[PDB]
Amino acid sequence: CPLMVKVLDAVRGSPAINVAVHVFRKAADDTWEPFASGKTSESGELHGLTTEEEFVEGIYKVEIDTKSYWKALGISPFHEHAEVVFTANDSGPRRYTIAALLSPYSYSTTAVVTNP
Amino acid sequence: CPLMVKVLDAVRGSPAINVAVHVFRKAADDTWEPFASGKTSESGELHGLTTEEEFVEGIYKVEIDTKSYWKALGISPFHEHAEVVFTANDSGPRRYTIAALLSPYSYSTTAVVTN
Amino acid sequence: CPLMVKVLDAVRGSPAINVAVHVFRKAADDTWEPFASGKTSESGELHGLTTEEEFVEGIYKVEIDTKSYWKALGISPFHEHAEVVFTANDSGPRRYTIAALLSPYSYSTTAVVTN
Amino acid sequence: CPLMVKVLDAVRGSPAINVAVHVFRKAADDTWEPFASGKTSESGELHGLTTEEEFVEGIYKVEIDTKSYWKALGISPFHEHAEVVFTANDSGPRRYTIAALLSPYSYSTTAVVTNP
Numbered sequence A, D: 001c002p003l004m005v006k007v008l009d010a011v012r013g014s015p016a017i018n019v020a021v022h023v024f025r026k027a028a029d030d031t032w033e034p035f036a037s038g039k040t041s042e043s044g045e046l047h048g049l050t051t052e053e054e055f056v057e058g059i060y061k062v063e064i065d066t067k068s069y070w071k072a073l074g075i076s077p078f079h080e081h082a083e084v085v086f087t088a089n090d091s092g093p094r095r096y097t098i099a100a101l102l103s104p105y106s107y108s109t110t111a112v113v114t115n116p
Numbered sequence B, C: 001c002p003l004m005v006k007v008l009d010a011v012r013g014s015p016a017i018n019v020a021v022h023v024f025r026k027a028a029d030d031t032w033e034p035f036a037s038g039k040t041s042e043s044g045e046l047h048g049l050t051t052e053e054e055f056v057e058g059i060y061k062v063e064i065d066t067k068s069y070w071k072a073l074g075i076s077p078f079h080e081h082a083e084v085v086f087t088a089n090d091s092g093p094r095r096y097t098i099a100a101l102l103s104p105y106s107y108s109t110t111a112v113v114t115n
Helices: A066-072 B065-072 C066-072 D065-073
Strands: A003-009 A021-028 A032-039 A058-064 A077-086 A095-103 A107-114 B001-010 B022-026 B032-039 B058-064 B081-086 B095-103 B105-115 C003-009 C020-026 C031-040 C059-062 C079-088 C095-103 C106-114 D004-010 D020-026 D032-039 D059-065 D080-089 D095-103 D106-114
Touching: A003 A058, A032 B022, A066 A077, A066 A095, A066 D106, A077 A095, B001 B022, B001 B058, B058 B095, B065 B095, B081 B095, B081 B105, B095 C020, B105 C079, C003 C020, C066 C079, C066 C095, C079 C095, C079 C106, D004 D059, D065 D080, D065 D095, D080 D095, D080 D106
Parallel strands: A003 A095, B001 B095, C003 C095, D004 D095
Antiparallel strands: A021 A032, A021 A058, A058 A077, A077 B081, A095 A107, A107 B105, B022 B032, B022 B058, B058 B081, B095 B105, C020 C031, C020 C059, C059 C079, C079 D080, C095 C106, C106 D106, D020 D032, D020 D059, D059 D080, D095 D106
């Protein structure tokens, strides 16, 4: 799994379950092309977005649909989404974990990058 | 000052000085229209972006040029930039502070919305 | 003002107002000696804790009473308090801001140390 | 595993390996009694601190030795340690994950609490 997303809820002290995530890759013409999408499991994890073959070099945007998450819980949050934008695989293949910790008016995000 | 941006550096324990910040407003066609920009001051703050008259309800994006910041300090960073996307809503308090706390592979952001 | 404490609320998007804060200094016998205390203001800040004369090098602990804060808002929190433990060092910059960003099951803290 | 600690490094984008962790429990006389200790693995995780039998109700302090971590990497950090203090198991047994994300002048921490 070369790209995994993990989301935690700082209000509940739990995984953030059923969070929609959309990944985009910047195209040659500088537009954001849809790359992959999914939603977090009961563990707060999203696996299986892509493959080593398909996850080529590029600039990627991981959009975590935080507003949709909070609204589904009946809470009115501040942000539309959390965006994580990074160059990937430019020194060869790596494995990326994008983690996020959510509150209604705040979030934090980090990356764990490993070389297989 | 209806909109202020504050940026802090978690590596050095300091304000993040001379960071470029661009604000965009979402247009009807879903494109991002330039709105305001500037560079953070010696205190890590960017004041004077807009006025009450100009800062109408809508969706805004604050893009913080973190990559250039880290590179100017000789540090290799992960992100291209940090983004903060939110709706300005007149039913809530009137002053928005968007704060960001930067590390090479991570950032935190919060909103402080007051009257 | 050599030491200031700032507290923000990540649930409401606001300063964290009327939060009790206690500062301790580590004594020679490794016990924590009361040093300064107060409650955060309407802006989430606590100024006036100490003076340059009193704030000598050493290990300090800033304890933020997060549990009472959340309970007063009707929210069940995880932590008993938030703690920030650090060394004041005269070789570095002279003004310390300890900032904390609170959620019910989480907190973030940073230091902004300037001249 | 009723108590697990996980530590990530926000500078390197990696697990925080070899981080010492000391857990204390508040005694009847209000002192902090040593409860358990260990260090994070190559995954940034620390397992096996305690057992369901031993992890009774109480107020616990998880001290993550961040200064020692950063100093071993040759960096002069701000904090002495990160302390996480909480009441545990007061509504019956739970499983607690204490996570921390470290930078030289900052850290964040969260809890994931689950009911087995």
